Structure 1
Amino acid sequence: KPVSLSYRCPCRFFESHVARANVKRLKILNTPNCALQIVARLKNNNRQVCIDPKLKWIQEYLEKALNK
């Protein structure tokens, strides 16, 4: 089993299935200690899942529009 119980990152899991249209709020936490951890709270599901940072829409939106 891949057991990585060593904390240098909050989001160990990432969902790439996140659609910006269904994202109520997201935030990319750029940890120098880890990498990009992003969170998506669904408008409909109301639940939050860590978003995969390599999603093209994520970086083009949160990183290019919000962050710039």
Structure 2
Amino acid sequence: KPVSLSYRCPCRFFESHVARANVKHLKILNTPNCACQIVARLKNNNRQVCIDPKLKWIQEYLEKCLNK
């Protein structure tokens, strides 16, 4: 799939107070239109939520994978 040029984001809406303990992973796509877009998929097999990159648990998440 040839990636084209247009201001779009994967997720247009973000989830906010989702449980960091209930997600399995994050997937980050920074698209020209959005600050930073993170998509997370819940444990077992449940819904997928797109998260705001500025969530406190994300604040913890990014900073800890960075420096600690």
TM-score (norm 1): 0.67
Contact 1:40 1:48 in 2 (8 A): yes
Q: Given the superposition, is the C-alpha separation of residues 46 and 30 from structure 1 closer, same or farther in structure 2, using an over 3 Å criterion?
A: same
Report 1:13-28 matches (<5 A): 13-28=13-28
TM-score (norm 2): 0.67
Q: How many residues are aligned here?
A: 68
Contact 2:7 2:32 in 1 (8 A): no
Q: Given the superposition, is the C-alpha separation of residues 2 and 42 from structure 1 closer, same or farther in structure 2, using an over 3 Å criterion?
A: same
Residue deviations 1:16-56 (CA, integer Å, cap 9, x gap): 02111001111222335532111121114522110112201
Q: Hey, what does 1:3 align to over in structure 2?
A: 3
Higher helix share: 1
Q: Distance in 2 between matches of 1:67 and 1:51?
A: 22
Q: Aligned to 1:63, what secondary structure does the other structure show? A: helix
Contact 1:15 1:51 in 2 (8 A): yes
**How far 1:8 moved relative to its partner?**
2.2
**How far 1:2 moved relative to its partner?**
30
CA-atom RMSD in angstroms:
6.0
